[PDB]
Amino acid sequence: TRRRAYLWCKEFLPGAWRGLREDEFHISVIRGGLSNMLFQCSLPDTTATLGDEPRKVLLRLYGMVLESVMFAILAERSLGPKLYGIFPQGRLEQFIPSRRLDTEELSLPDISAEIAEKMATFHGMKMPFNKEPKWLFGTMEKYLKEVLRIKFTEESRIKKLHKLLSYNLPLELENLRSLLESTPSPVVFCHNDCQEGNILLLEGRENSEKQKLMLIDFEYSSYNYRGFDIGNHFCEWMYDYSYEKYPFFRANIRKYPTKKQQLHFISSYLPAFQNDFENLSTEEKSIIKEEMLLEVNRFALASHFLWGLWSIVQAKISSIEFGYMDYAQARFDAYFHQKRKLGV
Amino acid sequence: DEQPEPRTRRRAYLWCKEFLPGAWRGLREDEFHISVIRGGLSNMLFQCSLPDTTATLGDEPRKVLLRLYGAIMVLESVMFAILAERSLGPKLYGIFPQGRLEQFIPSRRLDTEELSLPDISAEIAEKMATFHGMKMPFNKEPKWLFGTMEKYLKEVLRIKFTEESRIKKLHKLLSYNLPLELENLRSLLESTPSPVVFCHNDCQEGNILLLEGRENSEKQKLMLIDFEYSSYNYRGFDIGNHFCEWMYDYSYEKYPFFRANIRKYPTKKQQLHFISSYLPAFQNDFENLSTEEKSIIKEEMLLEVNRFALASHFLWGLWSIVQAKISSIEFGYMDYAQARFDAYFHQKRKLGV
Numbered sequence: 001t002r003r004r005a006y007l008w009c010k011e012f013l014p015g016a017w018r019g020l021r022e023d024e025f026h027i028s029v030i031r032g033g034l035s036n037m038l039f040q041c042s043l044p045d046t047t048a049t050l051g052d053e054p055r056k057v058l059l060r061l062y063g064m065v066l067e068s069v070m071f072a073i074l075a076e077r078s079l080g081p082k083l084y085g086i087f088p089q090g091r092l093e094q095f096i097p098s099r100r101l102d103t104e105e106l107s108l109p110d111i112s113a114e115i116a117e118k119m120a121t122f123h124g125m126k127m128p129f130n131k132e133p134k135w136l137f138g139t140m141e142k143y144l145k146e147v148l149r150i151k152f153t154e155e156s157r158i159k160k161l162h163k164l165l166s167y168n169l170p171l172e173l174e175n176l177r178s179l180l181e182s183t184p185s186p187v188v189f190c191h192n193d194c195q196e197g198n199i200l201l202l203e204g205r206e207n208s209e210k211q212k213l214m215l216i217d218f219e220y221s222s223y224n225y226r227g228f229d230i231g232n233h234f235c236e237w238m239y240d241y242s243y244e245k246y247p248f249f250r251a252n253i254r255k256y257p258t259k260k261q262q263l264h265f266i267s268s269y270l271p272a273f274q275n276d277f278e279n280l281s282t283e284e285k286s287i288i289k290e291e292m293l294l295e296v297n298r299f300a301l302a303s304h305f306l307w308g309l310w311s312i313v314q315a316k317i318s319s320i321e322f323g324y325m326d327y328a329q330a331r332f333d334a335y336f337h338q339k340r341k342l343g344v
Numbered sequence: 345d346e347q348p349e350p351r352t353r354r355r356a357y358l359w360c361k362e363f364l365p366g367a368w369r370g371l372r373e374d375e376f377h378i379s380v381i382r383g384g385l386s387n388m389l390f391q392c393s394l395p396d397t398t399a400t401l402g403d404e405p406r407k408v409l410l411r412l413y414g415a416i417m418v419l420e421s422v423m424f425a426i427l428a429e430r431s432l433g434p435k436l437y438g439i440f441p442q443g444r445l446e447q448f449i450p451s452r453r454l455d456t457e458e459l460s461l462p463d464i465s466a467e468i469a470e471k472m473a474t475f476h477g478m479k480m481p482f483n484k485e486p487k488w489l490f491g492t493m494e495k496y497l498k499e500v501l502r503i504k505f506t507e508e509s510r511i512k513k514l515h516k517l518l519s520y521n522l523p524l525e526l527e528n529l530r531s532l533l534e535s536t537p538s539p540v541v542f543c544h545n546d547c548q549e550g551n552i553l554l555l556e557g558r559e560n561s562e563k564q565k566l567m568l569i570d571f572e573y574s575s576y577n578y579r580g581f582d583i584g585n586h587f588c589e590w591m592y593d594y595s596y597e598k599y600p601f602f603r604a605n606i607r608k609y610p611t612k613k614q615q616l617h618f619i620s621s622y623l624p625a626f627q628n629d630f631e632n633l634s635t636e637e638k639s640i641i642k643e644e645m646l647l648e649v650n651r652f653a654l655a656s657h658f659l660w661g662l663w664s665i666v667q668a669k670i671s672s673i674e675f676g677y678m679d680y681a682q683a684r685f686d687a688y689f690h691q692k693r694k695l696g697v
């Protein structure tokens with residue numbers, strides 16, 4: 001691996017990387033794990049670059065074709081990290097000096113204003129993928145059917161899974177389908193996982209007011225209802241994954257964005273998504289806003305439902321230390337709370 | 345043949361309707377237009393279009409090219425997407441397991457005898473030099489050339505024909521002792537400096553588009569397409585291979601379905617004219633180096649591309665023998681293998697190597 005990374009870096013990267021010896025190779029882990037291990041490879045500080053090649057790069061081990069075409073495209077358009085090399089068991093990507101946002105930072109008005117802008121821009125991109133909005137319910141159905149086949153060993157998971165099934169998930173899915181079918185929402189290229197863990201604060205521009213963030217990790221990206229990408233992100237205000245004691249997240253329902261905070265986000269989103277929106281009548285803009293509010297708060301329900309089902313699947317299979325079943329139970333609690341709140 | 349089959353076209357209609365924007369997304373089957381551009385079993389080509397009475401709503405193309413992979417993949421897909429993003433290849437509208445949907449570019453392909461026309465050649469040299477300066481996310485080790493020839497050689501040595509004429513042709517070719525000859529070629533090219541760049545690797549006339557509405561422009565009427573063989577490789581191979589293609593006409597309508605003419609290989613003058621467009625297009629300062637150091641570069645570069653042209657004959661000669669066992673396409677692959685090795689040894693004699 002330290003050699004594998006050495007070979008991949010020597011062979012895929014230009015400049016000093018070409019003549020690099022193996023005892024000159026600097027690598028360290030950025031994230032271990034079982035799948036998608038991140039690494040930081042870099043030149044001797046005492047090595048001068050020959051061209052415009054990078055000094056430090058991010059390696060990503062997968063641990064099919066669409067994810068690669070996608071990442072290449074975003075790289076080409078300067079929407080994503082640059083792609084320096086791609087191979088069967090991973091790829092070399094640009095290393096972006098940054099940190100991830102924290103949960104509570106999402107509510108900072110400049111941060112959520114720029115996230116809205118960035119998601120709007122992400123949303124207007126054309127991609128060579130299927131533009132039929134199959135993804136949302138196709139994945140929920142795929143997960144549900146996995147869930148009604150999962151058998152757990154340990155009494156606790158059995159107990160928890162038994163509570164979740166008692167909601168009558170198949171019937172509840174139909175009630176959700178019914179509601180969203182009656183809720184218009186333009187299909188656009190969605191990130192589908194726009195949580196704080198996937199938003200870079202680019203270092204050196206913490207002082208920029210509108211250009212300090214980048215969106216990354218598009219493994220779930222597809223054409224999907226705009227409402228889901230926004231409602232999902234709103235849900236993510238509630239969940240903090242940096243908690244260091246099992247179950248390794250906190251949910252806080254009170255942290256869901258207020259009407260005022262929602263209007264602030266979409267008041268950024270809309271002008272960045274349709275460049276003619278800014279010239280509409282004050283009244284019309286509020287017609288569109290009030291209507292969008294209903295839209296994304298309904299699709300928020302699908303965020304809860306989808307990730308709840310996903311969280312149950314991950315329990316049975318994942319190695320990652322995370323209280324998946326407790327998270328599923330949190331997502332469904334927020335699902336039913338949001339139903340009562342909306343009166344739907 | 346013009347009419348697609350019922351199966352494909354029903355599937356074509358679905359792909360177009362779901363992958364393309366605008367008027368495409370609400371088209372009915374009954375108003376979908378599709379025409380064959382190439383049959384076969386491997387890369388079927390179709391033209392797909394809106395009715396002419398139907399109005400585009402926005403960006404969407406009125407016509408696209410459907411490409412089915414047929415009987416056979418991430419590197420090729422990524423490469424095609426990148427070149428589209430950079431406006432070097434056809435735009436990519438749709439990608440899926442069975443194939444892709446690409447921009448339709450009104451054009452015909454160049455004829456073999458057009459490769460030598462001065463303005464054509466100059467631009468082909470600019471386009472290729474441009475093609476070479478690109479950064480691509482692939483392995484930058486120049487192992488494709490001999491890796492590929494080695495793969496073909498090993499397959500070639502263990503294929504047994506039945507059919508007699510195929511069998512006799514294979515025997516004359518093995519007479520030459522290809523493995524030793526391959527090694528001989530390695531030593532010769534091992535001593536021949538050539539910059540490793542991103543090569544098309546199959547820059548023949550049928551992979552160059554003459555763009556419609558531009559037959560007047562002098563330096564902007566061509567586009568290079570079909571990059572299935574592309575990879576980081578010795579610059580000499582890419583140009584050498586192109587010079588070799590001057591000699592082969594695949595439009596010949598009877599068996600073996602090509603004409604070889606060694607007399608059509610570019611003259612020293614024509615080669616210089618080509619690399620005279622290539623070099624200022626490939627590197628910055630070149631245009632204004634001492635007329636005396638421009639010549640050393642040119643002369644050396646000729647030696648290089650003419651030596652690497654030997655790998656062109658050897659690679660496709662081997663490829664061709666492999667194709668004679670596995671391909672069902674009507675083409676005299678064995679005869680073409682011999683034709684390539686004739687030129688190889690004839691080229692060897694020319695170079696005194």
Ligand SMILES: CN1CCCN(Cc2ccc(CN)cc2)CC1
Pocket residue numbers: 193195241307320321322
């Ligand atoms: C799939 N995503 C959307 C739903 C929330 N996920 C839950 C999660 C958080 C942290 C960890 C720790 N590896 C695992 C799962 C993370 C991202």
Ligand SMILES: CN1CCCN(Cc2ccc(CN)cc2)CC1
Pocket residue numbers: 546548594601660673674675
């Ligand atoms: C792979 N390329 C480089 C070598 C020349 N080839 C020979 C060939 C031409 C036409 C046909 C079509 N019958 C088949 C093979 C095809 C292009």
